[model samples]
Each structure stands twice: as structure tokens, then as C-alpha cells.
Target: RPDLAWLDEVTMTQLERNPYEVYERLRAEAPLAFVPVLGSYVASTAEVCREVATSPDFEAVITPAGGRTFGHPAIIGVNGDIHADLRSMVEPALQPAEVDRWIDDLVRPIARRYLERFENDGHAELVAQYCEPVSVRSLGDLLGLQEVDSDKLREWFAKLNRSSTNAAVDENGEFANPEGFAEGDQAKAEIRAVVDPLIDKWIEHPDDSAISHWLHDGMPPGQTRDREYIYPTIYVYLLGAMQEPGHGMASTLVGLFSRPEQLEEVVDDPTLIPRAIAEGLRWTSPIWSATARISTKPVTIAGVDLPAGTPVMLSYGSANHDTGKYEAPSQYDLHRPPLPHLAFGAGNHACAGIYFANHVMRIALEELFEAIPNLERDTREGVEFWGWGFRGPTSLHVTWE
Candidate 1:
């Protein structure tokens, strides 16, 4: 039996700056290497990823705090029948067809309206104008949250998912909160304040909207799960669905422009955009780190044994870039041989919001790309990739002529 000779001491700050860089080094040495960095080990290889995900030996254990502040029930945290039941309860409202039908009204129009603003000027910040607003508004509409100000949501979400760079710093420039202290609490309160009345109304008089379905019919009334959890669940779902689709649309545009060949190919064949999106998810991997999953039983990884109850993290961003899995994984290859990637994650807890996300992005991109095919970047603009948990440009300035 080998001793713990392989684990590395890496900080949250170190991984926050660029998690892929941290995991990329590990994947090269031992994809299943034991990592002592954060009191746990990581697996980045396809084999290890499959093993950890599918292993009947491993079971999900909840944290003492229950779960992260910014998550929904039936999210990536839960396992077994509870996970299945909750997901089954909500999947219909988020199916591809349902989102597709609502796309024109909820998503596309926002993209078109924003793009139309610059039709005469031929200059616009695609990220600020089209990408950010459209995704937020579309999601707002999906949740039966109407007449809610999207700009307000953006600002609140900015605070909710504020980059880890400024997360700990207070308005007074003091280290007021700990590095990972959940700031989502305040955002949750704000959203719940607004959404609670609506939810109450829905429970009283149900409708066809997702909020209605979830509140009135999502689960058995007076079941083990209660009405109390709905606010947090909605909070998690709305915020979770909010960021990535917009970031994906915005980042994909940047990626496409960075390598115009892919854009040209997509232009030549419109069907290729979906492939390009696969590349986008693989390349960008908006969520920076794996949602922390705990070890149910004692397990040895890369010859290092860990006691049960040790917390572990999966590196999906790194897995997406594992050379062991995909050839030229670092490079965005729109034509790469199609394969399932872990950008949305794996196993039982994979993202429930994926179909809704795809619909949001497809609509956002359809209008922006088709209408503003000649978009250009504003070099004077800056980018903010501030946090360790998520990776996205806070500000992407661009002008298309």
C-alpha cells in the first residue's frame, strides 16, 4: 500500500484564479490522483470520472449546512429516489419543446430589440446589450415572474454571484466576510420577497406556469418536503439558470470571433452552430469547480486512502479539457468527433436546467448572429473573470459594424 505521497496543497484562491490550470497539471500526472489540497481528492480522467460517477460504492452525503446557498432541491446535491422524484416533478416544464415554443416571445425578442438599437449605429456591446439581458428576461418569463425588471435582476445577480475577487471585500474595503461566506442569503431574501407573494397566489389559484406547477403540483402536499423549501428551491433554480446561458452566449461569441474559421464554418452551414455550442460548453465550462460531493465510504484514489466523510470535489472544467479524453482538448474544435462531455456534469445529479439553458442560448444566438453577423469587439473594453467558483467575463465590451 502506497502512502499519501501525491496529494498537493492548493488553496481556494489558487484554484479560483484558474481551476483548469490547477487540475490540468494533475490530470497529466495521475488523473485519479489523491488531492490533499482541500481535505479531499480529485478525479479528472474519463475513467476516473466514470468510476466516481457510476461507482455503486460511492454515495452522496449532505454537508452539515445542508447544501450550498445557491442551489435548488433535486439539484446536483441530492441522490437516489429523492433526486429522481424532484427532477421528474419539474422536467416537463423545462423540456426542449416547451422552451422552444416560448423562445420567440421570451428570448428572441429581447435579443432582436437590443440588436435593433444598434442597427443604425452599427456599434453595440453584445454582452451587455443582447447576451446578458435576453437570457435573464427569458428565464424570468419561464418562472412566471412577469413585469420583473431584468436590469434589477442583473444587478442583484451580480451581487449574488459577485466574482470571488470582490466577494470578501465590503463597501468599506474591509475583509468583512470570509472568502466563501454565502452572500446568496441576501439575494435569496430579495428574490423571495418578490416571489413569495406570487408563489402564494399560485398555490391558491394554480396556473400553467412553472412556478405554479412546482408550488401546487411539484410534490405531494404535506409530504416530507414542505412549502418552506420552495423559496430556496426557486431561488436556486432561477439564479442557477440565470448566469450560464448568458455567459455561454457571450463567451461563444468571443470564441467564435477569436477563431473566425469556426464562425465561417457555422455561417456556411447553419446546423454547425449546435456543434459549435458543444465546443463552447467544453471550452468555457462556465462553472469553474465541481459541486463538492462527499465520500460515503472509505475509498483509495491514486493509492491514497481517505476516511469516510472526507469532502471531495470533481473538476468538470478540467475533465472537459483532459487530453486523455479529447484530442487537442485545449483547443476549441467545432468539428471534434462528437462525444459527451462533463460541462453539464455527470451521474445522477447532472444539471436539471440544461434543456432550458440550451433553449435560452439557441434563441439568444439565433437572433444576434443572424441579425448582427458582422459584430466586432471593442478593444478598449475590459474583461472581468474574477471568481474561483465560476468563470465568466464580468464586462465584455464590443461594437459590431
Candidate 2:
């Protein structure tokens, strides 16, 4: 076994807060550097990261050990035919065309209401008022969720996030399952209780929503009923895509406020909002860091030997900042080409909701700019940050002239 002693002092909490820089340095030296803190090595180079992501030789099985979660279908877990089937069930809803249709009415109105509420020269915490609520409302509505207390939903998700990171650390900060199996299992049950009802309703009523589509058509024809799989799938998608998009939106706004000069440019040319949204995603990358994979077979990378079963962490945020792949990589460029970004990972495990996320973000920005084009930051009030896994502002205080 590789001696991963160097990570004894590095907390994943610290890395979670600022993983991009950590990944960059690790990539420069040991692209396959081991960290006993995670019982995994870090994959630094863009090529190496891409290779690991795309290779069939590696498995995508989600273990109880590979926790600190994000994304649905638990794309990190499962492999082969099962992965493809589950992906096929709901992938159509996220196709670019479907995303475009929903953004105007579904996504746009949520932001319009939130932004219009504070149209005057009032400061607002974008995360609480606009981003989180709007994105969750739109996403839940898409799945036909009804009668859910928004606060209750948020609380459940907040706990879920805690459980995810809790799965990543021991008391000494070495990686161990702090999220005990029984506790994790119980949490999973509670989430399922919330999700399963909506899914059942959709299955019965058969609406034009995503859940109905999955119940009626998304699943393989003549397949056996598997409530365990379906229930977690719904809960994860609801909590997974729903939570992060909102956080990303708030973070992007923070990015804009921090760079007032760029804000002015986008304000002057409203056409830049879409570009700005994409650029913001690339810039702060609200998903923060991801729990990566281990090679199932011996793999050679960047001229280094990585034997089979060697655990690894591929920092998407770091690869997103790779200078070799991106010019002046750290600077946010709204007009940058729509290159494949690892922020959503790559290959088959790429975010299933990329289209949905972009559509919702674009709609939110469009409505916000139209309603409050002169929005500016209340710098005296300052900004606050939060989270161990999904990083973003604790709150955003902004004013419009």
C-alpha cells in the first residue's frame, strides 16, 4: 500500500473550501499523489483526469466508502448496463430542447418574482430569496412535487449534505465513515419517504412532468418494479440538482459583484448574461470538489505507474483551471468557447442535468437583469461563505441603484 502520510495534516474541510489551488499544486508535482487522509491519490493533469473519467477499465461503483456525495443516479456508483438503463430513463428531460421549453415559464417566473420583490435599492441575500427557492421550486414542479413545505425540504437537504461529508472524515481527520451505515441508511429512508409519495402520484396521475415520464416511459419497457432504485433516484435528483444550481447562482452573483467592472460590461450588453452564467459556473464552480474513483486495473498515467485498486481524486475544479487547457485560466471569460468543462465531470458521468442547470441559470440571470439592471453590491455589509462539500456564500447582500 502507498504511504499516504503527507495528508495527515490536510483536512478535506480545508481542501473542500479551496480545492482548486490544492489540486493545481498536487497536479504539478505528483499527478498521482496519494493522501492517506482520503485513502486516495489526487489526479492533477487534465489528460490524466480525462482518461480516468472515460476509461472503461475503471468502474463507477458507488461504495459506502466513497461518500461526500453530489449528482443523481449516483453516477459515481454503478456501472455497465445498469448505469445506461437508469440514465436512459430520464436523460430525455434534460436534452437541450426540453430545457429550453421549461426555462421561459417554469424557471423565469420564479426569478422574476424574487428579483421584482427587491427591485428597488434594497439589499437581498440572493441565495435565500432568489436562487435557492426559485431553483428548487422549478425543479420540484418539474417532477410534480406538490404540498411540500419548502423549509422542511431545505432542512432535509441540509442534513443530507452534512451526512455526505460526514461520510468523508474520522475524528483525527483521516478518511473513515463518520456517517455510520445505520445512520446513513436511516437518512436515506427519511429522504425516500418524502420522494416516494410524489413519485407514486406521478406514476398514478401520469402528468407531463419528468417523474411521470420516468414512470411511464423513461424506464425500460416491461421492467420489474424496483422501488428502492426509483425512490433514491428521485430524492437524489431533487436534492442533488436542485440544491447546487441555486448555490451556483448565488455564487455567480457574488462573482459578478466582486468584479464590478465586469458587472458593468454585462449590464451594458444584456446579451452577455448567458455568457456570464456559463463563465460564472466555470469561475467559482459551485459544486466545489467531487469524490472521485479508483482504477480497477493497473493504469499508467503521465508516465507514472498507477496500479490496480489505487484510489484517486480527480479535482474537476482544478482541471477546470488548467492553464494548458485554458488560456489565462483563472480569469473568468463570459465569451469563452463552449468547451467541455470538467466542472460537471466528463464522458458518461458528466452532469445529467447540465442542460437543465444552464437553462434555469440563464432564466434567473435574465429576469434579474431585466428587473434590476443596476444591481450593485453593498460592499460595506460584506459577503459570507459556507459549506464543506458544496461551497458558496452563506448570504449575499446586494443593492440596486
Candidate 3:
């Protein structure tokens, strides 16, 4: 049994409002603290989060009974051998070299095309006009899925995002927003209906694309024997692939433009774009609050004992800011010494699309800065960095002379 006395109405309200403050308080109180609302023990520091995320004792299993979370069980819940096999199949297609190859051929073109619409306009919302389409289109191209409507992808993700968050924190395993879940399910069904035929075609006649890669090289003999698995696996991959980079790229852009000095650093030295991107990722990770793992058995972390089946929320945002890990973790300094951040997560379950994300984001920034050499944040209303679980700006309005 864990203590739940610290939680009160004010604290709960703050949990949704400004969790970083709560995380700081919790980190000072204990390395791991239980939140009844989340029905999980949150690890706030880098060491504890790293241990829990990497340790085999902390299993990555997302069950229906555990909570009403989003994402396919095959990708999020499947652990041990199956997870490894699936990762193996998917990882090769997204390897650094392959993604690097695609950057010029696939990613650059999509990013440029999206930017073309807004570059000459002198004023635009970067999130909608630039970041979203660039990420969605690039991901769609990479996955070999044709006829991508960026609006539909954004719409589907909006529903899925709410549904997933609602599921994760819903203690009773019921949807906090049943309507959102329904919309997401319909969107998912439509996506599968569209994609399943493509997958079947790829299985028969492989091509030079990720879909074909998975069909030909990724799936193991044992797993491929079960034909039904392919559809869901692809769905999860697309969901994971499509959802992140946009928010991340948007955040990176926000992080840069908001700090004119830092933005100028990249502008002065175009080569620093990569470093700026890395710093942006660490400064404000999009998937900050939601990484979760379940304990298989009893485990002791930082002298605290956790029983079997204890759900542990790995606070990547908190860990990224741990003083023990970085000298000044709060500052978004691109010139700071490079070190690994848990933004892409850690251990075996680390993000497979990291290369793809980084590649697209780098190209996006490089190309954008080149086009709008004098890009600056819209100062009339200032700027705001918002969101709780999956953090990013709602809208990043900017202008250029």
C-alpha cells in the first residue's frame, strides 16, 4: 500500500494545470510517488526513471484492465520476444542510413511543398501551415501510403490523442471521453480499410518502401504466419510515426523562435541547426508526461519498495531536467555540451522512428530558416507553450519581413 495523503483538491487541479511544479515537489519528496488519479507510481528523477524504464522487472504491458489507453497492444503492450521481433522488422526500414537517404528524396520535398504555401505569405501559423503537413506528409510518404489528406491525419490524431490520454488516466478503465474514442475508432477503421489492401498488395509484390520493407524483411517467419497481425502492427506504426514529429517539430520551432538570441545562433551559423534541434528536443520533449511501464514483480528503486504489477509512469520531461544529468537542465542552450536525453525514451522500447523524426525536423528547420532568413515570433499577443501530457504549442504564429 502507498500513501495517498499528499493529494488534495488544489494539488489535483495543479496536476492538470502545471505538473512540472508538482513533479519538482514530488521529486523532492521521493524519487517515486503514487498518484491515485493516474493509478501509477511516477518516477521523477533521471536515475529512477532510467532504472525503471530499462529494468526487465518493469514490464511494458498495456492491458485493457490496467486502463483505457490508446495505441495498439501489439506495439505498446507486446513485450519480451514478440516486441523484439516486431522492433527488428520495423527498425531496419527506419535505420539512420535509410532515413538519411529518404531525407532528400522524400522528406525534403514534402517539407518544401508545405513551406511553399506559407513562405511567401509573410505571416502564418507555423503549426498548421508548416509543421503539421511537413511531418504528416513525410511520414505518409515513408510508410508508402498514398492519398494522404493531412487534414484527416490531424483530425484522427486529435481524437486519438484525447482518447489515449483519457484511457491512460481513466482509473475505472472507461473512457473519459467516449465520444472522442468513438471518433478515433471510426478513423482507425477507415485507415485500416484503406491500408489493409495496400499491405496485401505489398505482401504479394514488394517495392522500395517501408510497407514493402516490413512485408519482405521485417516480420519474422513465426509472426508472419499469423497474417492478421500485419494490419494492426502497421496501424500502430503509422500512428506512432505520424503523431510525434509534428508536435516535436512545432515545439522545436517554438523553442527556437521564442528565444531570439538562440534563434539568431542558428541563423548566424546554419550548421548549428542540428545542435539546435537536439537542444529543442531536450528543452521541451513533446511526449513529456505519458511514458508508462508495469512492474512484473517486486522491485526496490532508490530504497523504496514497489510491489508486483505496480504501474510506473516514467516522467521523461522531469528526468530530462534532473540536475544530476545536466548542468543547467532548464535552459534551452544549443551550445551546451551534448548528452543523451530521454526525449526519444530509453532501453529496448526506445522509439524506432527517432532517425526519421530527427531527419525530418532537421531538414524542416534548415529549409525554413533558409527561406525566411528574418523569421520572428508574432509579438502582438506574445507566445505560449501549452499542453500537459503531450506538450506543444497550440499555435505558433510567426512573421517575416
Candidate 4:
């Protein structure tokens, strides 16, 4: 066991406000050490993160003892064949072949629809009004989720975000938001009501939708009735797919706006847009960490030793920002050596939606910048990425020419 971290001394509220500082300190102290609030050893450096990612000594499982809560027993919690199966069910749609199909048609059209709605308005809160809706709709469109609009989707995103974040920490380390969970449950039920029917429909009439792919693509022809596996994985995908792309867009924009010189780098050379996007994702990781891995036995990471059965917190956020890896870990520099960042996963668990999210972001930036060239940050208010967990803009207020 490593040194214990306390809330009063170095708390979750403090972490929510500014987790980087804590991560920096932890990296300097013990890269893998016990956090009382979390009841696990947080792996805060890039090297340690990689070990946690690739090591067989660590098992990818989520339990209450580690991160303060339990998560859906979907793809994130499972292993081997099941993990591969769940991934195979939906990934073909987001794969290289299907990306161009959806982005140019489904994703771009939906993005333009929302962008057109607010284009004439001199000012707009792009985070909620644009980025989120674009994200949710793109996923919905591909996954055959046409039963509800973005309003309902955004409403659900809110409840789910609230429910998820409320657990990270609030009044105290042990606190969990009852209301957030309740609203999230209602949202989940609503999603199931719609998604269950959608799944069954796709089973009957298989088409190009991701759900259709899940039912027919590479799956045993008759095993499509596995609603238990399908729904939970889709639910997890609904939350993640939306946030990763949506927050990726918003956070990238925030990074560019905050640093004008870097924005110019992209403006001058269009190819650098993807690089800027990568840097922005690194600047603030959309998903702070992976589901988490439990230690199978005694493991030594970076000279730090941990006993058997300890849950190790793999900090993608911290790893990307490590002083040794990133030049100016905190600053947004698009030209930072082109090394891989852990914003998306590393090793075998890497997100299949990498190119999917990147193109959505690229197309989004192109559309927005083309529409509003004089995109300037609204000075009346400042925005912060909430929770530092999912790390999205509180609200991005921007004004056009």
C-alpha cells in the first residue's frame, strides 16, 4: 500500500476544480499510490498508464471499492470474447469504410442543420446549442435513433452527465447525488423504450444502420436476440459516443480560442486542423480515464509496489499531461512532437471511433469557421470544462462577424 490521500488535505472538490495540479503533485510524490476517497492507487504518469493498459497483471474491471461507484457491466467491464463481440457488433459502422459514408451525409447534414439554426444569430452558446446536438444526432442517426430529437437527447445527456459527475464528488468524498441518479434512471428507461423497439425493428428489417450492423454484421445470424448484451453496450456507447465527439469539438474550439496563435496555425494551414484537434483533445481529455483495471497480483509500476487486488486508476488525463511526455504539459501547443496521446485509448482497448470523432470535429470546425470567420470568444463570460472528468466546456459563448 502507498500513502493515503484525503479529501480535506487533497480533496475531490479540489480535483473537480483543478485536477491537473493534484495530478502533477501525485506524479512527483508517488505515481501509483492509494487515494482514500477513491480507495485505489492512481497511476498518474504516462509510463505507469501504459503498464496499466497493457499489463496482464491488471484486469479491466470496475468495482465500487475503487472509484466510488459501479458502472454498467457492458464492454468496459468485460474481457476476452465478450469484449470482442460487443465491439464487433457496433464498430463496423464507425470503421474506416463507414466513416466517410456517414460524415459527408448523416453527420455533416445534421451539423449544418443545427449550425444553420444559429448562424444568423450574432451570438450563440456553441457548447449546448451546437456541439452537443451535433454529437448526439450524429450518433443517433448512425445507430438508427430517430425516435427522438436532440432536445430529448440533450435532456438525457444532462441527466446522465449529472448522475455520473455527481458521483465523482460533491458535499463530501462519500456523497452521491440521489436526484441525479433518479433523473438518469428515467432517461435510461426512456432510451430503452425507444432503443428496444429500434433493436427489434432492425432485427426484422436489417439495413445500413449501426444497429443493423450489430444484428447482422459478423454476428451469429440468430444470436441477434441478445438484448441484454446489446442494450447496455449501446447505452454506454450513447453516453460515450456523444461526449467524445461533442466534447472533442467544444474542447478543441476552446483550446483554439484561448490560444490565438495556435488558431492561426490551423487557419493558415488547413491540414493542421487535425493536428490542432489532436492537441486540443490532449489539452483536455474528453474521457478522463478508462473504466479502470484491478490488480491481479503484486505489481511494481515505476518503482512503486502494490499488493494483489488493488484497483489502479489509469489517468489518461494525467498521462497526456505528464511533464516528461508533453513539452509544456499545461499549455496548448499544436506542434508538440506528434506523439500519441492517451485521450483515446492505448494498446488493445483503443476506441474504434477515433477517426469517426476526428472527422466529425474536422467537418464541424470547417463548417463553423466557414460560416463565421470572425469567430471570437465572448469576453463577458469565461468558460471552464466542468468536473475535469468528462472535461467539456461549461458553456462556450462565441460571437460572429
Best by lDDT: 4
User: Which structure among the candidates has the greatest TM-score?
Assistant: 4
Candidate 3 residue-wise lDDT, 299-331, digit = tens = 898777888988887778788788777876667
| Shift in Å, residue 270, candidate 1 | 2.7
Clashing pairs in 1: 16-388, 376-400
Report the poorest 10 consecutive residues by lDDT, candidate 4.
63-72
Model 3, residue 341: distance off in Å is 1.1
List candidate 4 stretches off by more than 4 Å: 1-8, 63-72, 165-180
Q: What is the TM-score (0 to 1) of candidate 1? A: 0.85
Which 10 consecutive residues of model 1 have the lowest summed lDDT? 162-171
lDDT, candidate 3, equals 0.71
* Descending-lDDT candidate ranking: 4, 3, 2, 1
Per-residue lDDT for 1-401 in model 1, tens only?
13335343455566666667667777777776544434345666656665666656565533222254544452556667766767776688777787667666777677777667765676766666777788778777777876678786676566555422232333343443444434556666777788778877776677777777776664566433355655555655555576778888776776776677887777666667777777888877876453556667888765557677665566677778878678877677777889988878766666777877876787777776687666666767765554544566666676666
Model 4, 77-156: lDDT tens per residue? 66778777777766777778768765778777887898898898999999889888888888888777776787888777
Model 3 — TM-score against the truth?
Answer: 0.90
lDDT of 2 by residue, 240-342 (tens): 5768788777777887777788888887887787677777776766664445666898888766687887666666666667777788766766657877677
Q: Against the unseen true structure, what C-alpha lDDT does each candidate score?
A: 0.65, 0.67, 0.71, 0.74
- Rank by TM-score, highest first: 4, 3, 2, 1
Q: For model 3, name the residue pairs that clash.
A: 68-167, 89-218
